[PDB]
Amino acid sequence: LHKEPATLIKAIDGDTVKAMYKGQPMTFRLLLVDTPEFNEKYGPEASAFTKKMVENAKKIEVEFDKGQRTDKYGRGLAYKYADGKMVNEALVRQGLAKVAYVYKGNNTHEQLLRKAEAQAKKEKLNIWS
Numbered sequence: 521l522h523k524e525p526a527t528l529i530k531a532i533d534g535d536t537v538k539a540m541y542k543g544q545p546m547t548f549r550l551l552l553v554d555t556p557e558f559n560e561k562y563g564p565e566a567s568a569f570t571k572k573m574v575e576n577a578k579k580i581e582v583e584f585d586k587g588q589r590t591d592k593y594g595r596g597l598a599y600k601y602a603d604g605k606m607v608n609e610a611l612v613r614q615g616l617a618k619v620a621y622v623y624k625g626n627n628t629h630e631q632l633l634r635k636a637e638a639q640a641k642k643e644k645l646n647i648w649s
């Protein structure tokens with residue numbers, strides 16, 4: 521996979537971030553994760569975690585997988601990186617997202633994220649507490 525440039529527009533919630541990509545605004549939905557909705561337990565905590573990560577970064581990048589790049593809502597499906605650190609993985613490692621929506625052909629980083637989830641679960645963090 522390849523990292524491409526994006527510029528933060530707005531963090532939306534734990535797993536969606538609006539960013540300028542090839543000069544157009546796109547809402548990105550993070551691949552292979554599911555954060556709680558803001559109205560749900562750990563929802564505000566996930567939202568804040570992603571918000572801090574992307575806002576504090578000198579740069580953000582998006583990395584598409586091999587399969588679908590857009591979902592049925594027109595959201596970009598990507599791995600998002602904040603100064604080279606993957607947001608998707610960080611959320612899972614902190615127990616603020618479950619590995620989820622793992623579709624064949626768009627699951628390059630599944631094992632990375634499963635390993636993170638196992639570690640979060642062992643530490644009883646957040647959703648696993």
Ligand SMILES: Cc1cn([C@H]2C[C@H](OP(=O)(O)O)[C@@H](COP(=O)(O)O)O2)c(=O)[nH]c1=O
Pocket residue numbers: 549550551552553554591592597621
């Ligand atoms: C992460 C992801 C979500 N989606 C779709 C499936 C779900 O459809 P449904 O809306 O019908 O439940 C929805 C979940 O996104 P959210 O967790 O943001 O609600 O987004 C994909 O199609 N591909 C993806 O890779």
Ligand SMILES: [Ca+2]
Pocket residue numbers: 535554555556557
């Ligand atoms: Ca969600």
